[PDB]
């Protein structure tokens, strides 16, 4: 019960987009980056780490090695972390700690 605003206006889509997952090590990792054409940089170094080693990258992170691309990639990807947070319902002793 706290008065509070929010919103957004992004409509950005995309009509081919390679899966990625946690269980995807660094083979598929690499593909997924390539799909959305990031950066021939971007690809390789992020091509080499696993599926949560990348994931594991922060904002800063990723634009620490893919410089200012890097932003675009943080924006993309943790777009798909939430996705994949909801696709198998089954969470043990899991979730929100506050709300």
Known sequence: G????SGFRVER???ASQPLTYES?????????EAKAFSPRIVENLGILTGPQLFS????ELKKVC???GVRVYSQLTMQKAF????QSGSE???????
Do not use: M
Not at 84 to 87: G, N, R, T
């Open 84 to 87: 994949l947070e909801k696709q």
């Open 2 to 5: 706290s008065s509070g605003s």
């Open 25 to 33: 090590g660094p083979d598929e990792v690499r593909a997924w980056l």
């Open 57 to 60: 990258l922060n904002k800063e």
């Open 67 to 69: 410089g200012e691309e």
């Open 13 to 15: 889509s995309q009509p």
């Open 93 to 99: 002793l899991s979730g929100p700690s506050s709300g």
